[PDB]
A paper describes a structure:
Recently, studies focusing on the naturally-occurring phytochrome-activated diguanylyl cyclase from the bacterium [name] (IsPadC) have suggested that asymmetric structural rearrangements within the phytochrome dimer eventually regulate OM activity (in this case the OM is a diguanylyl cyclase (DGC)). The PSMs of Bphs are bi-stable photoswitches, which reversibly convert between red-absorbing (Pr) and far-red–absorbing (Pfr) parent states, thereby capable of regulating the dynamic range of a variety of OMs. This transition between the PSM states involves a Z/E isomerization of the BV chromophore, as well as large-scale changes of the protein backbone. Therefore, we generated the PAS–GAF truncation (IsPadCPG, residues 1–312) to address the effect of the core chromophore-binding interface on dimer photoactivation.
Surprisingly, IsPadCPG eluted as a monomeric species from the gel-filtration column when purified under dark conditions. Crystallization of the IsPadCPG monomerZ under dark conditions revealed the absence of the native IsPadC PAS–GAF dimer interface. In the Pr state, IsPadC and the IsPadCPG monomerZ exhibit nearly identical RR spectra in the entire spectral range. The spectra are also highly similar to the prototypical histidine kinase Bph Agp1, confirming the typical 15Z configuration of BV in the Pr state in the truncated construct. The low signal amplitudes rule out a genuine secondary structure change but may reflect altered intramolecular contacts of individual peptide segments. These structural changes in the PAS–GAF domains can be rationalized on the basis of the present crystallographic analyses of the IsPadCPG monomerZ and dimerE/E that reveal a reorientation of the NTS helix and the switch from the β-facial to α-facial coordination of the BV cofactor during the Pr → Pfr conversion.
Author numbering: 6 to 312
The structure:
């Protein structure tokens, strides 16, 4: 039936991806009522992240006891309080932990990750080399190929592609960089339903989406202290937001174990994405994420100017 097939296609765009009440297990998440300053939701894995800074905490139970001010660094709490704008993430890096938090209505949402030892000035020197290569490009075809190659080198993903939307949100792959033999994806077309409108809109909130392992077990948000409002909390601005299992299976069918995509914007208009696949699971720290986003933004700026 024709209208039935259309119902099914329309269901794609209606899965509530913004409120899964779970996360990917490469970080831990705390949800805290702003006025109560009380921990109301915590990921089922919070223990193994806050046990790195605080040794009193070894179980999810201990988080009901825990105070925010022992768990979170002070600059994080001060920035989150002194922040008026909703959904704009603050980042605070201790000696052991990398925090990203933001305010959404009466909720503070805090994501915490681990990180590797860093090399000073590496972020900036890498961006400098990308800035110079993208700026020396004089046609869009050199620009986009250069972009895929740089994203490939910075991230180390097995495959980096530029996926360009047409006026109806259908898209095609227009450039490719690979770390191994692959059958070409060049000029392969995909329908608009493969990235439903809700996912397309998510790049306007967080321009990078990151999936380190398609088979990693999502961790649900447990209730800690009974929140005033039991509505689902919107997790859109972070990176830990659990992945729609449909898209996980889509990645498996692709032969992919890790994914990362970055929106390509012209002003507020989503023009396309950088799509990144890995055959084995892969994680990339916050600094590689920010470098990728910043590289894509400079490439976009160049893309709208050159012929
Ligand atoms: C009925 C629903 C469907 C559906 C849902 C869905 N898809 C995403 C997210 C993404 N889909 C992407 C598609 C592509 N990746 C590629 O490499 C290519 C072509 C080479 C395409 C077309 C991409 C890139 C994303 C972003 C995530 C990522 O980078 O992997 C979501 C959002 C999931 C989430 O963000 O939690 C949803 C709900 N896909 C379908 O095919 C139908 C069945």
């Amino acid at each position: 039936g024709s209208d039935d097939i259309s119902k099914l296609i329309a269901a794609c765009d209606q899965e509530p991806i913004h409120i899964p009440n779970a996360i990917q297990p490469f970080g831990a998440m705390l949800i805290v009522e702003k006025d109560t300053q009380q921990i109301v939701y915590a990921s089922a894995n919070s223990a193994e992240y806050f046990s790195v800074a605080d040794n009193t905490i070894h179980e999810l139970s201990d988080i009901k006891q825990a105070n925010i001010n022992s768990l979170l660094p002070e600059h994080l709490i001060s920035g989150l309080a002194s922040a008026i704008r909703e959904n704009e993430p603050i980042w605070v890096e201790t000696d052991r932990l990398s925090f990203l938090g933001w305010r959404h209505e009466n909720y503070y949402i805090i994501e915490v990750e681990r990180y590797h030892v860093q090399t000073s000035n590496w972020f900036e020197i890498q961006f400098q080399r990308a800035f110079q290569k993208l700026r020396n490009c004089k046609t869009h075809n050199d620009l986009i190929n250069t972009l895929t190659r740089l994203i490939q080198e910075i991230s180390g993903y097995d495959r980096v592609m530029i996926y360009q939307f047409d006026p109806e949100w259908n898209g095609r792959v227009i450039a490719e960089s690979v770390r191994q033999l692959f059958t070409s994806m060049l000029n392969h077309h995909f329908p608009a339903s493969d990235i439903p409108a809700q996912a397309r809109a998510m790049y306007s909130i967080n321009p990078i989406r990151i999936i380190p392992d398609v088979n990693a077990e999502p961790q649900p948000l447990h209730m800690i202290h009974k929140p005033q409002n039991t509505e689902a909390v919107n997790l859109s601005s972070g990176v830990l937001r659990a992945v729609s299992p449909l898209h996980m299976q889509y990645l498996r069918n692709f032969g992919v174990s890790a994914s990362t995509s970055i929106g390509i914007f012209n002003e507020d208009e989503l023009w396309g994405i950088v799509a990144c696949h890995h055959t084995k699971p892969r994680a990339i720290g916050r600094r590689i994420r920010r470098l990728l986003v910043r590289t894509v933004e400079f490439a976009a700026e160049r893309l709208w100017l050159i012929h």
